[PDB]
Nucleic acid binder design. Sequence first.
RNA 1: CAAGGUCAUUCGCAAGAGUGGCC
RNA 2: GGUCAUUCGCAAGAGUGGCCUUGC
Lengths: 417, 417
Amino acid sequence: DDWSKPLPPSERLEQELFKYDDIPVEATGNNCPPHIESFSDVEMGEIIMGNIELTRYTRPTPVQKHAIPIIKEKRDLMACAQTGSGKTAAFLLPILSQIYSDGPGEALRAMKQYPISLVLAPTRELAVQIYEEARKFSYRSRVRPCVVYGGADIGQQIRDLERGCHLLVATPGRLVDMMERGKIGLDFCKYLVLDEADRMLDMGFEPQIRRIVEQDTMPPKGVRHTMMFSATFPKEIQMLARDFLDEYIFLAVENITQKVVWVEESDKRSFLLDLLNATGKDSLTLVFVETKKGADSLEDFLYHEGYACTSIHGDRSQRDREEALHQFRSGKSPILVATAVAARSNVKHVINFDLPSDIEEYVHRIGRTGRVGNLGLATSFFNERNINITKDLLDLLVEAKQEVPSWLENMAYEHHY
Amino acid sequence: DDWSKPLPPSERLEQELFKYDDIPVEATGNNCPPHIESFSDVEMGEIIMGNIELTRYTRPTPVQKHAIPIIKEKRDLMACAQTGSGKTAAFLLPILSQIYSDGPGEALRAMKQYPISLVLAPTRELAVQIYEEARKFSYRSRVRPCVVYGGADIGQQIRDLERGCHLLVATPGRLVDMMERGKIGLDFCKYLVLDEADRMLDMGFEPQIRRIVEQDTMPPKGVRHTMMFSATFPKEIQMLARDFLDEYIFLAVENITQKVVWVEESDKRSFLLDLLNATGKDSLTLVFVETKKGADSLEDFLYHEGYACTSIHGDRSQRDREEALHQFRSGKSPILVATAVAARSNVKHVINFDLPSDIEEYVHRIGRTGRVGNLGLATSFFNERNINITKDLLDLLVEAKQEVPSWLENMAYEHHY
RNA sequence: CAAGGUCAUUCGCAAGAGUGGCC
RNA sequence: GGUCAUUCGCAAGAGUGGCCUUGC
Ligand SMILES: [Cl-]
Ligand SMILES: [Cl-]
Ligand SMILES: [Cl-]
Ligand SMILES: [Cl-]
Ligand SMILES: [Cl-]
Ligand SMILES: [Cl-]
Ligand SMILES: [Cl-]
């Protein structure tokens, strides 16, 4: 009855089983656990780490970087995250990891089915999707996932439950039916997550959810560990979160024309001058560069060429920074040269004089333009010093439905394949 | 009382804690388990895999690649391996891995000290060395190693034991002393390894070893798991192995002048012709090349230049191979051109026309010369295509006390550092 | 003094390419 | 055909190193 010990392998089973808008992400709450950079930063045990290998799962998605460490400290979570941010692994990994570590508990040890974990989904296509990922992370484990949803044969689902159910995925209406039929009890449900809670509300599932969570045998908030996921955060969702969550963490996650052009290092100042000379009366331009001395040298160059500009970087005093922000937003010096210091308001044009080394700085940078309904332009200079970001920038431009330079996908092929 | 679960970390403790002759290696026995290429191919659990990370052990030494899989399948082992082959990790990792997996057993649960594992060493230099390696692999575990040796204060060792001892490292004379004093009992010793058994015999420790292993409470062979390590294998060691081991696996692991020279690809045939033209009357030369058609094209070249040579590679029939070995061994065609097919007798000169991609194939190749008391010569041609083996070949030449080309250690610096 | 990113190398993992060897 | 091993490109993890960027 050790649940941290992996079962004997099975290769037949093995082969059967085996976006960018969400990168500005902030979690706020009491003693919020800091976000991780890799699945290695949390110790989720042999089975979980094993099955992570088998999925070929590489790095944690932005939501996974913040959700996973929150879940592992058994803190409730209200997460506003969209379809495609890696929500499923974000809660399935730490929950199962804890289930392996603790085992089934003396109630189910000295023993209808009692799932230790209940995942509620609005639709059949998402319930099955969550279920399929649960089997991949429960492979070679004694934890058996099940899935239960309306619109299909209830007789076959009943037959699957009786083969054992410790993690249950379900749609609200079909789960209510299984408890009236006395096939499921929630008396030992220590983990409850609600996926796409907004859609679950939109589809009219609140009475079933309140019946599942409040009018029956499920342990209350503070005892059970609760997670809510929803793409939008209207007040209806906030009131359900205050009803269902306890001392929780709030986690929150392209009207911009993006142009990438090839510019050799010795041509960058000339290319910049041409972009500035085509800039309107009082449009503000944000010029991002790599190094503090780069920002210093470039502001002097622009001054000697007759452009009213200013500068800001990490070694600037808070006073020097305020002076630059004054001249910039008064329009007197409408060009601001900055390092990463100014990646994290109403800027019309962001120029990546130097592209950054990682795709996340690129997101933060272009996020200073094209704000709240305005039109924004982001122009980036690219050469051989930037192949380290070829593949991630190409993937981003494709997702953003931006024009992709034909030579850029050619260099992604030639370097990565 | 779960021993697979890691303890809370400890920062202070962490930084407190954190050859090439041995690579022709063969294990023979009944259903001998196959050798591994990485520590990952055997599942030694969270704690072990953890602490391997923390020591930064990257790959298994040749002895480890064969010993570890043998130990994990609970097979006795007689290993002829020298100090410096990674013996300690070879038995410490799988033994501790199993102890974590099984725990202490229901005997020690309901409870002088009873070590589950006893390591016997000839000297305190090796006892302390093994003990320090055991602490690195038992960090954050509930398994406590101890070390006990003559020549030091027995009073301090006694008080270390009663803080708990599950893995005991000891010298024979000081151990028997502890069991006469009733401080150590062997009634639960399921793992026994004897390190440098030859030296232990040389130093006169057989009566103590026979008293420890045969005349007291240690479980007999076939019940306990026994491993013997010794640098030499005289018949005295073999008789001790037949008394102490049960259905065991036998594991067995610089009179060659080695020259490395820079040869561009278009110059190799010219360089080879000069080596052949300086070859004695009835000396046999082995010329190793990379590809089968490389071997074909080179035997044709040597033929059209008037050299009696022959060839062998993987796509040659057993008949074609015997014909080539006939002309080679008779002296009629004293040059044999071969791929790796002939790396694994009385060869005077081995020429690595093409250096191999891995350092293991290199030694197997040079092992065909300088055998049975004969000064052998090994000539290797090197260029840009062989930088992948720069550091392994440089390290090997240094250990072999061979002359190192000054340009070779310079290219190791510029590529790896 | 803390964080993070990139680059070199070492190392385990997958996909891919090339080559070698075994039946 | 089927198995195995090595190397190289890339993806991702850990350490060393170098470089750079931030916070105080
Ligand atoms: Cl439903
Ligand atoms: Cl339950
Ligand atoms: Cl200031
Ligand atoms: Cl050793
Ligand atoms: Cl002694
Ligand atoms: Cl014992
Ligand atoms: Cl034949």
